[PDB]
Every structure is written in structure tokens, then in C-alpha cells.
Design a binder for this molecule. Sequence first.
Ligand SMILES: NC(=O)c1ccc[n+]([C@@H]2O[C@H](COP(=O)([O-])OP(=O)(O)OC[C@H]3O[C@@H](n4cnc5c(N)ncnc54)[C@H](OP(=O)(O)O)[C@@H]3O)[C@@H](O)[C@H]2O)c1
Ligand SMILES: NC(=O)c1ccc[n+]([C@@H]2O[C@H](COP(=O)([O-])OP(=O)(O)OC[C@H]3O[C@@H](n4cnc5c(N)ncnc54)[C@H](OP(=O)(O)O)[C@@H]3O)[C@@H](O)[C@H]2O)c1
Ligand SMILES: NC(=O)c1ccc[n+]([C@@H]2O[C@H](COP(=O)([O-])OP(=O)(O)OC[C@H]3O[C@@H](n4cnc5c(N)ncnc54)[C@H](OP(=O)(O)O)[C@@H]3O)[C@@H](O)[C@H]2O)c1
Ligand SMILES: NC(=O)c1ccc[n+]([C@@H]2O[C@H](COP(=O)([O-])OP(=O)(O)OC[C@H]3O[C@@H](n4cnc5c(N)ncnc54)[C@H](OP(=O)(O)O)[C@@H]3O)[C@@H](O)[C@H]2O)c1
Ligand SMILES: [K+]
Ligand SMILES: [K+]
Ligand SMILES: [K+]
Ligand SMILES: [K+]
Ligand SMILES: [Zn+2]
Ligand SMILES: [Zn+2]
Ligand SMILES: [Zn+2]
Ligand SMILES: [Zn+2]
Lengths: 352, 352, 352, 352
Amino acid sequence: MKGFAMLSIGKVGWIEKEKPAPGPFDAIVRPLAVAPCTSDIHTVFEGAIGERHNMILGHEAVGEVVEVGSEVKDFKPGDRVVVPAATPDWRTSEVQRGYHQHSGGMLAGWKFSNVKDGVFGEFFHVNDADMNLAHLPKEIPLEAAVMIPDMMTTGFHGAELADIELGATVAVLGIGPVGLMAVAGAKLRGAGRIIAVGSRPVCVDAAKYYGATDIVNYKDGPIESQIMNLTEGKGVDAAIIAGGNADIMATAVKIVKPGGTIANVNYFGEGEVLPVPRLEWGCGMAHKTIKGGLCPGGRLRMERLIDLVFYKRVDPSKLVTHVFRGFDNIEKAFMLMKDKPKDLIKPVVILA
Amino acid sequence: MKGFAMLSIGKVGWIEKEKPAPGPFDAIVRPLAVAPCTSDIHTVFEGAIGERHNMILGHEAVGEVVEVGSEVKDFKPGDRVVVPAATPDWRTSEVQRGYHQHSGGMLAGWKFSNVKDGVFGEFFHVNDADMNLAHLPKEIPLEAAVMIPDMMTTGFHGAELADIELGATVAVLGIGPVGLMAVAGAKLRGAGRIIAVGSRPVCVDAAKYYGATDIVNYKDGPIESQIMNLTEGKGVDAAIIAGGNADIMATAVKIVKPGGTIANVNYFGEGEVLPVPRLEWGCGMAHKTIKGGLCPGGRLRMERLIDLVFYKRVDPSKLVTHVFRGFDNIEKAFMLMKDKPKDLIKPVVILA
Amino acid sequence: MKGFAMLSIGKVGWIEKEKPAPGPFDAIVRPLAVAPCTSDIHTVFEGAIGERHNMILGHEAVGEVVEVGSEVKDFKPGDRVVVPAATPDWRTSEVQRGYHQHSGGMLAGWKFSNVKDGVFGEFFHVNDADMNLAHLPKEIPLEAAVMIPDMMTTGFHGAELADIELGATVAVLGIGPVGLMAVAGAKLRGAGRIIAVGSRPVCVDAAKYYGATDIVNYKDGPIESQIMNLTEGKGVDAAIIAGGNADIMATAVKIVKPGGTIANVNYFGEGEVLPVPRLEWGCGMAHKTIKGGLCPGGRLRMERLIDLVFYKRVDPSKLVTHVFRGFDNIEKAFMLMKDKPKDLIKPVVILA
Amino acid sequence: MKGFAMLSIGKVGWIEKEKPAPGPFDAIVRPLAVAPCTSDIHTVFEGAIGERHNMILGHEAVGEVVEVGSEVKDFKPGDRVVVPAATPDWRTSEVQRGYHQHSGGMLAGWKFSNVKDGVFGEFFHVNDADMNLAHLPKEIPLEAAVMIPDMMTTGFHGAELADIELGATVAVLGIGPVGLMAVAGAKLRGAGRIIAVGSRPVCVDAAKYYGATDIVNYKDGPIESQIMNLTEGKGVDAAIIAGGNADIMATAVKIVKPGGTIANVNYFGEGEVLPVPRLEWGCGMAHKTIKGGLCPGGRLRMERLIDLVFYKRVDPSKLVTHVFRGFDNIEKAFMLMKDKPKDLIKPVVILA
Ligand SMILES: NC(=O)c1ccc[n+]([C@@H]2O[C@H](COP(=O)([O-])OP(=O)(O)OC[C@H]3O[C@@H](n4cnc5c(N)ncnc54)[C@H](OP(=O)(O)O)[C@@H]3O)[C@@H](O)[C@H]2O)c1
Ligand SMILES: NC(=O)c1ccc[n+]([C@@H]2O[C@H](COP(=O)([O-])OP(=O)(O)OC[C@H]3O[C@@H](n4cnc5c(N)ncnc54)[C@H](OP(=O)(O)O)[C@@H]3O)[C@@H](O)[C@H]2O)c1
Ligand SMILES: NC(=O)c1ccc[n+]([C@@H]2O[C@H](COP(=O)([O-])OP(=O)(O)OC[C@H]3O[C@@H](n4cnc5c(N)ncnc54)[C@H](OP(=O)(O)O)[C@@H]3O)[C@@H](O)[C@H]2O)c1
Ligand SMILES: NC(=O)c1ccc[n+]([C@@H]2O[C@H](COP(=O)([O-])OP(=O)(O)OC[C@H]3O[C@@H](n4cnc5c(N)ncnc54)[C@H](OP(=O)(O)O)[C@@H]3O)[C@@H](O)[C@H]2O)c1
Ligand SMILES: [K+]
Ligand SMILES: [K+]
Ligand SMILES: [K+]
Ligand SMILES: [K+]
Ligand SMILES: [Zn+2]
Ligand SMILES: [Zn+2]
Ligand SMILES: [Zn+2]
Ligand SMILES: [Zn+2]
């Protein structure tokens, strides 16, 4: 049918398509709430993943099941489901290795608006419904639930990769929606001091809400010097990268103490090389582990985060600053992500 | 000096001993606040660690440094410090393996009221001050800080041993002071649903405060049946044992799902064998990992738990139900632990 | 078709069933070489997993694909394959948790001769062929290859569970075919000293071949005292249980040092409880981790063990002491596992 | 007391100092066998660790204890010992975090020929003898034992950091003495295929001896293309960096599959930045972990590696290509490392 799609490199618009058909194990979902992402901007305007032709955008959606294949057992038409941004193929060798995000190739667990039609349409296709859908409790509002498919699972993954010990000091570089969930994720991993690096006031306020004990604004000086002064030269036990340019990797290495971990969940769109400073990395021997992973998807990941919201461990509704209602307003919410206003964190479009 | 001591098996009383002298790396501390433990009850009236003669009891104390050895660098007379219940020798082979709790032998990190005069005296000896003391911030009151040396580090260790994934369902068997900190620890590891098992109303109330979402009373029926009904037959991702008799190990194995973890921090004082049910343990193949560890000690452990309290990640003051004043009430608080009233969780003696 | 089956508890015999039909993702395999297992003895004559009716026995087989479903992509009729004893359903919640051995329930990844007709028949059914089959290189003979499905993956799993550090001292309690692979697995994890506990000379000879540095005969005296004398009172860093009765769990705990690991891969067929000694387990606080897991299965596991054999890291051929030829000798080889002669390690029936 | 020392940047020569005196916990050792290292060449002629003045060189030594402090308990005059290159202070906060290599600061566990007179003297000082010395069994020759302090512990550390699963494919970039021990280390962790990258025939021969299944010579083409062709486009499960310049980091990321690990133990002496390719690192999301650590030291590490040699798990004598006799030949063996002949791997000077 109609869908907000990438017409060509650098240009987008509504196009004409056929309604997707479900396989024996798949399901067709109609969206109830959707959200745009900064990653979709990188695909369109920077060409970071190559050239696409008439591909629907969007990968964050909470919808209602309308049709299932003959083999779907746990979902029926009428069920209220959370759809993860990553819907991998669960029958490959990379799944047996424990990295479903790369099932079938690097980043191949991320299908929506990458190698597969996204969620910005009246219907979309979800492969392996029993493995890639989670029921949505009535107690969770749509605006909060639509932060789970991507923002919550990415930010929490950064905290998971960070290997946070109880009471450790954690720095979160960047407090966009992913970084704000990284701040909340560190609090969920038992972090004591959480130092957040950001400038936008609407984000700084939300960072304190999610557990940040210190805010480092670049208006006071270089980030490295500020954090080293805050930690009295000790540094941080772990740094979570959730924003910035390639140089932020150098900053993370400089502020993490020997034996610590740099956990990256930032999608670097430009630059050939990510710099690792030789001297500050101990010339290769400082035991500063560097991790960088795509957000996990699938049913279990969604079910675990739904319980965190259900039992009031984290409230993602603070991420939602703008709410829209039309299918035509999907374009408007997208435009907000193109040129970030200072009062926007994450916009949500309620469809039905 | 004076000290409340274990005279023989079944008898305690105040005695007179010589004030301990510090070695070049040691410190002499006078207590500012102390707390009795159920373990000392087991030592005196059950002979759980054998017979002692004129051994000062107690291993939970916040104190003021009065004297240090010539080689102590980070602590001077007058410093208010949190003293860990475990003060191990940091120069053994077990420390290089990462198990300071067993530095020099099984449970050898536990010295106070075991192989060394405890803290229930006008002064006590702390070996290796720079490695086994942590500075106490003025912002933390004495009643809350004296929960850190033993209760918090033990309860949090149960949560650490449990290998909790984000959103996992955790059962805490026993909600005494250690179990209440296991509940708080489970919340500090991103647990979603936390099922606490206990009956005493003062403990049930504190368990809800520290994050318990469900309360299971053993007076209403078998714990296994209740928890399986709550989890709709799925079981729990992890069970933390913090109380009960030897049979509670069988209960933990039965409620943990295949691949889960049983983390024990309960001190079993009676029974020759802890039963592991064959069928419910998968006849040996259910991947139900069983862990059991003594609480971590040392400076770094105390500093990180102090940071957790300082940055308001947990408030252990709700563990304290009775506060008395002065040395003479150490006896009153000790006997309070033997005859457990239904309103007692943890008593504190302020030595101002 | 014909099949050697368990009629009821205590009864075995040849039966007749319908040749299995493959689903779209399944494959029908005819066996080229099979081996009986001690686990089937426990299932039939001890009723360790309950009563079965006309369940064809056997779960260790190398076969030839004769039929595949329409969706099988990597295997065709005529391919010679190694079939893992564990062939789990790869589309479950337990797979997303990382425990395919319990996909769909405790031990539910083990289907052959458990909840599904085994391999001791003219044909057998393999669910999810592309995920549960591995190609057999021509360089590996059938007698050696049939040690991979069960013996090698189980024994190596014991070493994996043991958390062996480079140079650590490992004890292997029991040197049947599984224990001998635990010896080889421990060598493959960088173990230094490997202490093997067994009495049968044919097993003692194979233990030395696979890397055992010391032999402890339990008929020669108490295991604990002998091992404690060998390690000069230190104990072992890890103990792998691969045989014995329920009492061997107490033996393992007594010989492992504080902080070490007890890794069980032994299938306990009798007894209600596996005893854990309270005092030797530190009264619950010795950090002696107890693990017990079913062997991993699936394509990737088989492929990696095949690579270990291909690149000559392990030669499982020395496990095979008896080779017979023909379907009728499946009964003879099965009975050989029942009345264990002193010269038997593992028998193989060639159906070529 | 004489010692071969670094006079200034670019100059070396023999000096005279006063024989060092041990503190109460230290020991004075006279060397029985020493070996020069490439790190000392970089220190003297490239100033890789800054400018030093009149510092005795050398950090690889087997020696005889001649004097101990009053508090040394496990070592007496006359004991033959293996001295780790890293002799950290075991009483710091970084030790309680589990990183003794950085006890007191980044790389602060490395004292010999860094902040302390090295082992190229008639005597040298060992701090904390009971924690930093290991008894040398008479069964291990000096030439083999002197490979343990540095080469073996470094190379094996690369294999440990690599997170090798049983049967995994491992690439070792660089086959100098450290890389050759990384190959042996990969074999110890259960690697199947081991791909070694090198050109010198004496190293290629030793690489096959230690377990390499494939050799990649740059004379046949680019390393990235050769390795991807060998693995049929799959890549390797882990890459161990043990040589080369900063550009080798980019090669490692390119050949490791998503979810794998890059383990670096190479000492990068020049360059401001270590390049990480953005696209081949999944734009930050490929789950390609990068680790880089200094070699472990201390008594326990040495004792476990001694056991590996004692029980014949690894023979490091293949690393020794040149053997000299007498103190005066320390200069000759040192200069041998500066202008490496194609037949040199590691030289050893036998003393006494
Ligand atoms: N791994 C995954 O699965 C995944 C999932 C979702 C998104 N992503 C991508 O990863 C990144 C997450 O960012 P986001 O979604 O939270 O929105 P975002 O607005 O792009 O986050 C960027 C944050 O980093 C700050 N920043 C910019 N330059 C910086 C610099 N040199 N140093 C320090 N901070 C700097 C920004 O500050 P100000 O804006 O206040 O000026 C902002 O706080 C995005 O690129 C996103 O597309 C990845
Ligand atoms: N690992 C360490 O380093 C360490 C440190 C300190 C203490 N410990 C020991 O760990 C244990 C923790 O006890 P505590 O200090 O927290 O005080 P506690 O009051 O003795 O804790 C006992 C808890 O277990 C419950 N309980 C008793 N029987 C039960 C049963 N059949 N089923 C379910 N629950 C049952 C009790 O419920 P109700 O009382 O509400 O009825 C209570 O909640 C103690 O034995 C202590 O000596 C260990
Ligand atoms: N986890 C899994 O997936 C899996 C897979 C396959 C098999 N298994 C099971 O694991 C167990 C391994 O047995 P197996 O197949 O290798 O053949 P097995 O011959 O039955 O192994 C028994 C071993 O234990 C020894 N033993 C008997 N009593 C002992 C005692 N008190 N103390 C110490 N050792 C004692 C035996 O010594 P001697 O015979 O020399 O006297 C023998 O070495 C079996 O029960 C098997 O069913 C499990
Ligand atoms: N982390 C620690 O504690 C520790 C301990 C000891 C040493 N190290 C350092 O780790 C490094 C290991 O070197 P080493 O001691 O084993 O002696 P080495 O001779 O310097 O090892 C260099 C090896 O790497 C090869 N090589 C050179 N350039 C290469 C490239 N672009 N790509 C792949 N291979 C290349 C060399 O072959 P060709 O030159 O013949 O082409 C040679 O085989 C040294 O720098 C050493 O200082 C670190
Ligand atoms: K690290
Ligand atoms: K487990
Ligand atoms: K352990
Ligand atoms: K990884
Ligand atoms: Zn996104
Ligand atoms: Zn206590
Ligand atoms: Zn079997
Ligand atoms: Zn060196």
C-alpha cells in the first residue's frame, strides 16, 4: 500500500506497494504506535549502509496482531504485542554462538528498514512471530511501550556490555534517548556514581531522573579533564558510548581506569577509522576492554524489558516529549529527527 | 580494657583483657556503633566454630581510628571508618585466585569473633588497615553504616552470585536482614519480579520497601507449590538462599528453572548434608548452578557499598529496628538476637 | 521397520514400528554406526526418567541421510552425517536463554531414547536437520566419529563447566568413556595436573593416553585422603564428576579447594537426594560452585568437535574396545553395557 | 656489584652499584639464567617508556635466593626460583579489582627495567618474595624456565583474553617468541584450527611445533585476503595480536567474525593512534571485542605455568635459539636482540 520510504539516496517520500504476506511462521502486525530513529537519518542522508530503492523506513513499533501463519502457536489475531527492532533469523550458526544480532551476517538481526520493509505502513511483516513478538500488558501505555523495541534495549545493552560491578563509577558519553536508557541501565546494574556527558537541557533533566549523579557540560572544558577531576584522577570503572563522533572513542579510553571497560552502542556513520590512543590504552596493555554491539532483539529480550516496565523498575515515558496522531504525522515526527530541536528527546506517533 | 566475650559454649559476659597493640600495618579502632549477628549466637550457644575462651564477640562495627602502625598510609588517629566483617590477609595464594574470603584457609577472611577478638570491646585490632578499612562520610549516619560491614555485603553477594540478567525473576528464600539486602541487591542487578519468602510482618514490610513484588508465606503451604503457581509453572531465573534449614536447598533447586542459579549466603549451622534433589536437579544435568559464598570484605568492597548508600541507591537504615546506647547495652542487644521477637530485624548499639 | 526398544521398566526387545516421515525441516537418517550408552541402562532397568512404552533405544549414531523435508537446505539424501545425541527444538524461549539442552523443558533437548524413538532402528527421525546435523569428513572413521555425538561432547562439557584456568589441577572422578573425554577436555582447557580416579586397567590405560598424570584407585583406599596427599593438602582447583553413586558428590566437594568448581556430567540414576556435605562446603560459604549440565548438541557443537578430531587435537578411537557388525549385534552391544566386563570402554556396531 | 644498564637514550654499558638490601618482605636473588627482550631494545633506542638514567636492564630471570627479609616465610637462601617479569605490590586497590598488572598505576606491576634496576646484574631485588617468587623444580632446565617469566605468561595471556571456545578457529598475528607462546596458548584452550601469520623460517618451524595448522606468509598476498580465503569467508573466532605496527589492529578486526574477540598482547612502541576500521567493526556494533593486557605476574601465575612445563603440556625450549655463558655475554645477547638475525627467536645467557 502506502508507506513512508526512501526514494533514493538523500530523498524520501510516500510510495505505492503491495500488502505483505505472512509465511507459515510469520505474522502481519498493524502498528498502534511508532517512533523514528536517528539511524534512519544516517541511512538516508549519509548512505552509511549503501544504496536502497523504495524501502519503507522505521523499526520501532508497538502493534496488534491481525494475521498469523498456520504454525504460529503463541499469537493470534487481536493480541497486543511489542515488536523488537531486531527480528533475527533464529536458525543459523551465529544463533548457536550466542549472537542473534548477527544471525546470517554482520548486523543481520536488524531487518526493518535495512534489508526489509520497515514499520511505517498500515501493516508490516514480522518473521518468526513466536520468537520475535512479546505480549503487551494493558498496564503499559503505548508511548512507554514503544521505547522498548530499540531505545531501551540498546541503552540497557550498553550497560550490560560495560560489566558494571556493584557500586562502580560509570560515565555515559552522550545523553540522547539511547544514552538516557544507558544511564537507567547502569542504575539497574547497581552503579553508584553515574556521570552523564551532555548539553541539551531537556536531556540533562531526564538524565538526573534516570539516575545521573553528575552532569558534565562541554561548556566547562574538555570532557577528559572534567571527569578526571570529578574522580580525583581515578577515572571511571566503565564508560558507555551512546553518541558523538569518532573522537569520542579516544575520550572513552582516556577516562576509563586500567582494567575497565568501554561499551559502545553508538552507530558511527562517518570516518574510516575509530581512533584508539596508544599511550592512554597502555600501549596495548592497559586491560581496557572495548566492546561494541548491536541491540539484542527477539521475544525474550522484549519480555524481560516489559517486566522491568511492568514492575516499575524503569519508566521510559520521560523519553517521550512529543506525541502525534496521523499517518501524515509520521512524516512530521521524522522531520523532527532530521533537524533536532533543543526540546525534543523522542517523538511518538499514535496510529489507532 | 573491657570486652563482651564468649566465656565458654553457652556462656557470655564482660571480661578484662589487654588493649591490643597494632603491628606496623595494623590499626587500633574504638567502636562508635556496633551490631550483633546471628552467627555469634551460633558460635556461643551451638558451638558452630568450636569452643572459645574469653574471645570478644562481634564483627559489625563502625569506629574511630585511635592508633596506626608505622606503615599505615591512608588512615590516621581520629578517622571515622567502616570496618568490614571480613578483614583477610591480603598476601596469600587465595587472594591471587580472587577469593580473599578464603585467604589462608576456608572462611579465613572472617577473623573477628572467630580466630580474633571481635569488636564488642573498648578497642579492637584491624589487620592491614590500608586494605581493610574505608573512610566513613559524614553524610551517612551510624545506624545505617553499621549495616554495611556484614548485612549489605552478604545480601548483595547473594545477588552477585545469582548471575541475574536484566528483567529476570528472582526468589529470595528468607527475609532476615541478609535476605532483605538480597532483595535490594536483586533490584540493584536489574531484576524485574522479586519474590520474597518470609512470614514476620516487620520483615515482609521491609522486603516490599527494598523491591519485593510478591510475598510468599510458608504458613500458607509449601513454598515450591506457591512459587510455581506465581510463575505459571515457569519457575524463577535465580533463587537466593538467605535463611532456613538444610531443606531450603531442595526448595531452591525445585523453584529454579533449568539453566538458572541457586546462590546461597545462608550460614547452615546444623545438619550433616545439604540435600540436592536428584530428579529436580535434572538427575545431575539441569544446568542448575549452586553457589555458596562468604561475604566479601576489604576496603574496596566497603568503599563501593558506601558509594551505593552515599548516592542513595539503597538505604539500609530500614534494617535497624532497635537502637540502644552505651557498652552495657551490647549484652542487651546480643541476647535480643538469641530470643528473636517478631518485631526485631537488626539491633544497633550507639557508643557515644 | 525394526527397532531395539524399551518395552517397559526392566524389559527390552526388538519391536516393529512405522518408518518415520520427515517434516518440512526434518530428515530421515539410516544409521551407519551406533553405540549403546550407560544412560539407556539407567533408563530401562533403574527407571531414572520414568516408565516408557516401546521407545526404541540409542542416541549415539553416525548415519546416512535418506530423506529430507522440502525446507532442508544443507543436507541431501546420501550425505554422511554425525547426529548429536541432543537434537533440540531451536525455536523456544530456553534457546534464547542460552540453554538449548533444556529447550522446551528440563532435558528436553535430549530426544532420542527419552521422548522420541532412538537410533537403534532401520531409520530414525532428526528434527531441524540444518540445525541438528553435521557433515562427516571422510578423514574420520565411523568408529571414531560415533564417539562425538555423546561421549566427546559430554566429557568436554564437564571440562567447560569446570572453569579451568591455565595450569590448574583438575580431578576427574570416574574414567568411563565420559570421564576419559573429561580428561581429554581438561587437557584441552590447559590443565596441568590431571588426577584420574578409576580402577579398571583398560580405563586407566586410556586415561594416561588422554592426559592423566596421576591415577587414584578407589578400591585402593579413600579417594579424599589419596587426592589430598597428592596435592599436599591443597586440593584440586576443579573436580569433574563422570561416574559413581550419590556419595561421589560429597567426595568432589571435599577435594576441591575453596573457590573451586565441581562440574557434574554424571547421570545419577538412583537415590532421592545428592548429598552436599555441610562442613566441607564451608557451611554454605566456601565458594565451591556446583554445576551439573546435560551435554550440548546441535550442528555447531558437532562441527567444532569434528574440527578437534580433524586437526588432531583429540583421537576418540581409543574409547572403542569392541566393534561388531550387524543389526542383531545391537542387542549384544547393549547387553555388554548392562553387564560391564572389565575390558569394556565403549562398543560400536557397524551397519555398513 | 656489576650490572648491564641503560646509561641514556641510545647508550648502554656496564656500571657498578651497591648490592641492594631487602626489606622485611623482600628477597635478593642472584641470576642463574637471564634473557633479553625486545621491550628493552625499544626502551633504550626508541625511548618507548621515556628517558631513563643508569637503569640496569632485563626482566626475565631464573635465579637463586641469597638473602630474605625477616618476614619472608616461603623462601630461604639457596632456593632456585622463577622470577616473574611483573612483580607488583600486592597491597593496592587495583589488586582488589583483580588487575595486579596495574597495581599502583597503569602497567605499574612491571618494575624490572622500568622503575627498578633489572635482572642484568650480579644481584637484583625482588619485592614481596612470598607473593612474587615461585620455586623452580630441578626437572626444568634453565633455558626453558627463563621463558616462563615473560614470553610464556604474555603469549598465554593473549590466548586467555581471546575467549577461545573448544574447537574454535584462532589466528595469531605475529610469531615472535610471544606469538609462538600465543599459538601454544591457543592449543591449550582447545583451539582447533590455528592460523599463524609470519615469514621467518625459524619462526614458522616453531609455530608448527606449537600447534599451528596453517601459516600465512605476506609474500603470497595481503593477510586479510589470505585468511578470509582459508576460512571460506567465515573469518576466525578469535585473533591474537602478538606483533606488528599499529596497522595490524585493522587487520585483526577485518578477519574476526562478528561476536569474536581481538586479544592484543603486542607492545606498540610508536604511533599516536591504533586504528579500528569503522565498517569492519560493524560501525561500532559488530560485537568484536578488543582486549589488550600486560602479562600476568606473581607467584601463582608462575607456579601454574611451571606446572604446564612440568607435566609436559608445553615445551618452551624451542624458543631458545642462542645460548651464551657468563655475565659478559649479556651485552652480546642484548645486541643480538637489536639487530635480529633471521635464525634468532630468543637468546639465553647461562650464569653461575
Ligand atoms: N547500537 C544500536 O542498536 C542503536 C540503536 C539506536 C540508535 N543507535 C545510534 O547510536 C547513537 C545513539 O544516539 P541517540 O539515539 O541517543 O540520539 P543522539 O542525539 O544522536 O545522541 C548523541 C549524544 O551524544 C552528544 N554528542 C554529540 N557529539 C558529541 C561529542 N564530540 N562528544 C560527546 N557527546 C557528543 C550529543 O550532545 P547534544 O545533542 O546535546 O548536543 C547527544 O547527547 C545514534 O547515532 C543512533 O542512530 C544505535
Ligand atoms: N555468608 C555470610 O558471610 C553471612 C553473613 C552474615 C550472616 N550470615 C548468616 O545467613 C543467615 C541470614 O540470616 P539473617 O542474618 O538475615 O537473620 P534471620 O532472621 O535468621 O533470617 C532467617 C530468614 O529465613 C526465614 N525462614 C526460616 N525458616 C524458613 C522456612 N522453612 N522457609 C522459608 N523461610 C524460612 C525466616 O522467616 P521468618 O523469620 O520471617 O519467619 C527469615 O526470613 C544467618 O544464618 C546468618 O548467620 C551469613
Ligand atoms: N550429561 C550427559 O548428557 C551424559 C551423556 C552421556 C552419559 N552420561 C552419563 O555420565 C555417566 C558417565 O558414565 P560412562 O558413560 O562414562 O560409563 P561408566 O563405566 O558407567 O562410568 C563409571 C565411572 O565411574 C567409576 N566409579 C564407580 N564407582 C565409583 C566411585 N565410588 N568412586 C569413583 N568412581 C567410581 C567407575 O570406575 P570403574 O568402572 O573402573 O570401577 C567408572 O570409571 C553415566 O551415568 C552416563 O549415563 C551423561
Ligand atoms: N604484554 C607484555 O607483557 C609483553 C611481554 C613481552 C613482550 N611484549 C611485546 O610484544 C611484542 C611481541 O614481540 P616478540 O617479543 O615475540 O619478538 P618479535 O620478533 O618482535 O615479534 C614480531 C613478530 O611479528 C612479525 N611481524 C612484523 N611485522 C608484522 C606485521 N605487519 N604483521 C604480522 N606480523 C609481523 C614478525 O615477523 P617479521 O619481522 O620477520 O616479518 C615477527 O614474527 C613485542 O613488541 C614485545 O615488546 C609484550
Ligand atoms: K577489562
Ligand atoms: K546455570
Ligand atoms: K567458585
Ligand atoms: K564479543
Ligand atoms: Zn533506531
Ligand atoms: Zn555476621
Ligand atoms: Zn548417552
Ligand atoms: Zn619482555
